[PDB]
Symmetry: C3
């Protein structure tokens, strides 16, 4: 799981400072669970999004975790990312996490691809 | 058969900057993919909270969806990244994912 | 097994307009994918800068994420497009991509 990117959407409304802290902390979580250095970790966080999950528009979050190229790692990543949100008052079953792995030739960085 | 380019950045653009970006980046995609000019869906969200390499310096995330190959992906990465480096972004803070 | 519909538009919606849209579009996903609404995620972003066919006229982009066929995809496209055309969008400015 190299070059990971975590894209987050939530209907919660965060201050600018809350988002700055969130991208740091969620990025550090990604770095830790995937065993990748923080220098390649990308995090995007969009708040104030209209979200409905299970028919309810209560607080919820949608996340996609993308990376270059695992049952075990996915479970640890799901748990750790979900814990950041439950630590901030979200119900865990309203945290939707999807994983999108990619081949090196499908990842652009620094104007090139790693293939 | 029409590609889609989804763009997110923590940079803040004026309306004219957004208008020019979706036109120019859309035309880059059309040209590199061998599609007609304007035959592309482009979305651009600015002011997004972004962190890359631990830093909240200006950065951009792009997803390019086309119903692509190793060679075309490299040309697309270079051409899209050049647009951003020409507009003040660091080349190593541009992530492009191909689908 | 939990589908997600991600919507972006350059239209501007009120909070009440967004609430109604996520409800009705989510109900369409439930029906066309044959999944209970408890499994369906909908996100909606308005005020997005969009260009489609070279034009920044009112338009909507949708990505439907669900594990998996031509037949269901055709019905999904038709039903989701009808919601937008019933709510003031031009049909040829509705773009839907499927990600299995």
């Amino acid at each position: 799981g190299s070059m990971p990117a975590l894209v987050i959407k939530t209907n919660a409304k965060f201050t600018e400072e809350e988002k700055s802290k969130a991208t740091e902390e969620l990025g550090n979580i990604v770095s830790k669970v995937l065993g990748k250095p923080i220098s390649y970790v990308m995090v995007t966080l969009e708040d104030g999004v209209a979200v409905r999950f299970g028919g309810s528009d209560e607080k919820a979050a949608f996340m996609s975790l993308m990376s270059i190229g695992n049952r075990a790692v996915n479970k640890r990543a799901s748990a750790a990312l979900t814990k950041w949100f439950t630590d901030h008052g979200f119900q865990g079953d309203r945290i939707y996490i999807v994983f999108n792995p990619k081949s090196a030739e499908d990842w652009g960085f620094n104007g090139d691809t790693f293939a």
